[PDB]
């Protein structure tokens, strides 16, 4: 508050919170190799209207064929990032494998349909993972022609995401099942023209779409990570299967469901988790917090302080002293006392007193301070009285207590050069 002379009272200052200690990582003991080197190096890579689909289940996803390769035509993560990729344990990411010409990579996004990605393989608009692409002009694109693989280019309109028809429809623009060569009656089959000396926009790009089915269970596929041990009643760190964070753990009290993991109690804040190795544990993430607010008597009398904490039980707080867990990490600072009731909490530096002065500095809930003490409160000038009937007083002296009264009849007449 920028003064040497500062007056008396609870003055606000910054936060306080408790640093976590442990590093709880709870992954299942699922240990496996993904079909990654199987899918991205397959002997089979189909067309786009006949797009391959693969579920990836119960693996340990290394993401280590990913980062050390210059082979990739488009190593690009759209709604996600490449580097924070093994940070969560997944349930059934989905590879979508197909052979395109050399220009459909731009034509693959949330959006960016064109004709090929709207007549052969339709994309979503909410959940994304990563697209991976490469060329295989040295095996597939034979300069004599590789007319083996095809695409479709005639249909009544657009599509919904992740949806496929193998049906070679001999198209006519109002139904009408034709035999080509009839009028407006063709077949949608169209070769790829894949030569070894073919153009750059004509290259056979074996392209995989990755959808990331993001945690619709206690999941399966982790990354190369290290599950650790549980702690209760202590603020620790997290990284669960699709969760992270910082909190205080205790067991649950649910009617918990078999498909279920989360609790979001008041709104969207998860507040109870099922451990991936069969435990039911509430996650009270408020480790402890509130703001410090210094009691000081005014520096014409003292430099003796007391640090009033707020959302505290004074039990992890003496710990946060003597395990050094307070983020206002204090140097010259002991544990003289710990007055704690009136559930506003921890008052390091005053004492329980019944001698009730006029309540100088009002503390938290009813408690007040003096000298330094912190009693509760005098209610006022107590009186024992017995109002009988005829007995009546009338004053015969007085005073004229001229008091102040202070009424601010203007503020500073201000103005702003909003042009300056």
């Amino acid at each position: 508050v920028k003064s040497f002379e500062i007056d008396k009272g609870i003055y606000q200052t910054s936060n306080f919170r408790v640093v976590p200690s442990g590093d709880v990582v709870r992954f299942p003991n699922i240990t496996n190799l993904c079909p990654f080197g199987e899918v991205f190096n397959a002997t089979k890579f189909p067309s786009v209207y006949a797009w391959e689909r693969k579920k990836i289940s119960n693996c340990v996803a290394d993401y280590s064929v990913l980062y050390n390769s210059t082979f990739f035509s488009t190593f690009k993560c759209y709604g996600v990032s490449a580097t924070k990729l093994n940070d969560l344990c997944f349930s059934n990411v989905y590879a979508d494998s197909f052979v395109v010409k050399g220009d459909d990579v731009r034509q693959i996004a949330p959006g960016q349909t064109g004709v090929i990605a709207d007549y052969n393989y339709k994309l979503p608009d909410d959940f994304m993972g990563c697209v991976l692409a490469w060329n295989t002009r040295n095996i597939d694109a034979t300069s004599t022609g590789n007319y083996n693989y095809k695409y479709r280019y005639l249909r009544h309109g657009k599509l919904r995401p992740f949806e496929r028809d193998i049906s070679n429809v001999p198209f006519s623009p109002d139904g009408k099942p034709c035999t080509p060569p009839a009028l407006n009656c063709y077949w949608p089959l169209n070769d790829y023209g894949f030569y070894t000396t073919t153009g750059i926009g004509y290259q056979p790009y074996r392209v995989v779409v990755l959808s990331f089915e993001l945690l619709n269970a206690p999941a399966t596929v982790c990354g190369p990570k290290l599950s650790t041990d549980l702690i209760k009643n202590q603020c620790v760190n997290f990284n669960f299967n699709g969760l992270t964070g910082t909190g205080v753990l205790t067991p649950s009290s649910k009617r918990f469901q078999p498909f279920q993991q989360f609790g979001r109690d008041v709104s969207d804040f998860t507040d109870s988790v099922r451990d991936p190795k069969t435990s039911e544990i509430l996650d009270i993430s408020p480790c402890s917090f509130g703001g410090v607010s210094v009691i000081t008597p005014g520096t014409n009398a003292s430099s003796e302080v007391a640090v009033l904490y707020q959302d505290v039980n004074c039990t992890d707080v003496s710990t946060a002293i003597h395990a050094d867990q307070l983020t206002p990490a204090w140097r010259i600072y002991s544990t003289g006392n710990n007055v704690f009731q009136t559930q506003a909490g921890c008052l390091i530096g005053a004492e329980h007193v019944d001698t009730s002065y006029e309540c100088d500095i009002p503390i938290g809930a009813g408690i007040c301070a003096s000298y330094i003490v912190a009693y509760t409160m005098s209610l006022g000038a107590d009186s024992s009285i017995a109002y009988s009937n005829n007995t009546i007083a009338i004053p015969t002296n007085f005073s004229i207590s001229i008091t102040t009264e202070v009424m601010p009849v203007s503020m500073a007449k201000t103005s702003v050069d909003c042009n300056m």
Partner: protein, 156 residues
């Protein structure tokens, strides 16, 4: 110093946006202060009409005694009043008698309570030991003497 046309102005507009919300916040909070300050200012004019142009008989309104006078003095941005109050300070002890039951009829006094039944001597005021010889105008013809609590005879 490194300005281009476009993206530099986008940063500038970020500053304009922040400064503008901040200033507009300042405006709005000033206006809040203005509303609070003007309710109080109306109070100040109100008190200077009541307390200063006269004696505001409504009690503990100007002064925290009973407001005998008041005195304004100016100040930067505000004003300070000096309340000439009235705080009584002493005590008697006497009995009461709500009537003056003299001839069999009751006499409720002057309404303005406590007939001085300090040995039924007189009738006194609200706030000082202020005796009155009981006569034709210390009371009135008030029914007859039936629901009295006190009897005061020898009214001559």
């Amino acid at each position: 110093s490194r300005l281009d046309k476009v993206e530099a102005e986008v940063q500038i507009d970020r500053l304009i946006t922040g400064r503008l919300q901040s200033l507009q916040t300042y405006v709005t909070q000033q206006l809040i202060r203005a509303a609070e300050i003007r309710a109080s200012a109306n109070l100040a004019a109100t008190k200077m009409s009541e307390c200063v142009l006269g004696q505001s008989k409504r009690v503990d309104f100007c002064g925290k005694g009973y407001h005998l006078m008041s005195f304004p003095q100016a100040a930067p941005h505000g004003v300070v009043f000096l309340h000439v109050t009235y705080v009584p300070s002493q005590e008697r002890n006497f009995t009461t008698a709500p009537a003056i039951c003299h001839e069999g009829k009751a006499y409720f006094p002057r309404e303005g309570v406590f007939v001085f039944n300090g040995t039924s001597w007189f009738i006194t005021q609200r706030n000082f030991f202020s005796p009155q010889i009981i006569t034709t105008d210390n009371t009135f013809v008030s029914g007859n003497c039936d629901v009295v609590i006190g009897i005061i005879n020898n009214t001559v």
